[PDB]
Amino acid sequence: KIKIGMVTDVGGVNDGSFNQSAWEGLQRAQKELGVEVRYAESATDADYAPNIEAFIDEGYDLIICVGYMLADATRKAAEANPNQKFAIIDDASIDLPNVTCLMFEQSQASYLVGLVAGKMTKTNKVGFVVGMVSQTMNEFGYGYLAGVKDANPNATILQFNANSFSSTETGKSAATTMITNGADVIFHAAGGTGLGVIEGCKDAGKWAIGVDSDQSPLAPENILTSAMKRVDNACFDIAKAVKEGNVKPGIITYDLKSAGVDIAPTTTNLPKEVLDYVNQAKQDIINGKITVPKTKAEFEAKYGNIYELDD
Ligand SMILES: Nc1nc2c(ncn2[C@@H]2O[C@H](CO)[C@@H](O)[C@H]2O)c(=O)[nH]1
Ligand SMILES: [Zn+2]
Ligand SMILES: [Zn+2]
Ligand SMILES: [Zn+2]
Ligand SMILES: [Zn+2]
Ligand SMILES: [Zn+2]
């Protein structure tokens, strides 16, 4: 039997977003492909190495490390276990024959939801709650702020780094404070912490924007959209490659054109004018007409010092 193991990050498989979507894709892979799937949650980074080792020792054909913080542990395990195949989501630093890097152009989807936030705010203040700061996480920020400003040059983006992907209290408190200070749309790129962000928006009667999966069921009257990142499909696809015997190492990048990132399929709360505007911007990115900044220098060159979490 083909066995695929998932090592999840601190967020947990019930995060409503990143890890939950990765796991959902593996559950689908089990149903459709016949692979046997199991996950191991890591309470802290001390659990990364033994969780990887447990799948190695049990004969798993592929170990999927979900999240950029697993990179160091994945590299070390891949070097020490040349016959073991690994995949890692959201980090592309590892160049080894047994490692596939699954990357997502999240700045593209974040830009689109920033257009939504800029067009929907009535106070000209919107919020961004990020789970941690890192190169990949800042791509959410750069895209979102660029979208907000392109849609609404006079909008202010309030920003907060929760320093956790698994703290719903931090998410709720930060959202509530932003709302007290006038924000009326809040986007999170914060994993499980975002469950708190969404609850804070719902409680205050404001708009939220979710991430990774279509988070609208968590607050159907308050979610405008979500910046989708199809970690489910990427995990399914690599499971398929394992089953077929054609896993390739290196970088696989999922973008808007590949449908690997997107805005959510639920659009019930988007005015037709807004949906049309965002959909045109999506096709312009897909067709190459416009490019979203995803690094500090590119973002600052166009928007100045307005992203405060990268300094
Ligand atoms: N390293 C890591 N990143 C996460 C986690 N949860 C969310 N993220 C990131 O935050 C984004 C928004 O949830 C995801 O697409 C990931 O990039 C987690 O538990 N660990
Ligand atoms: Zn658990
Ligand atoms: Zn089926
Ligand atoms: Zn607090
Ligand atoms: Zn799915
Ligand atoms: Zn900055």
Residue numbers in the entry: 45 to 355
What does the paper say about this structure?
Clostridium thermocellum has extensive potential in lignocellulose biorefineries as an environmentally prominent, thermophilic, cellulolytic bacterium. To gain insight into the structural mechanism of the transporter specificities, 11 crystal structures, both alone and in complex with appropriate saccharides, were solved for all 5 putative sugar-binding proteins, thus providing detailed specific interactions between the proteins and the corresponding saccharides. Combined genetic, biophysical, and structural studies have provided solid evidence that transporter A and transporter B are the major glucose and cellodextrin transporters, respectively, among the five potential sugar transporters in C. thermocellum.
Although no sugar was added during crystallization, a clear electron density of a small molecular substrate was observed in the structure. However, neither laminaribiose nor cellobiose can fit into the density. Considering that Lbp has about 35% sequence identity with nucleoside-binding proteins as shown by a BLAST search, we tried to fit different nucleotides and found that guanosine fits well into the density. Furthermore, the ΔtransporterL strain grew well in the medium with laminaribiose as the sole carbon source.
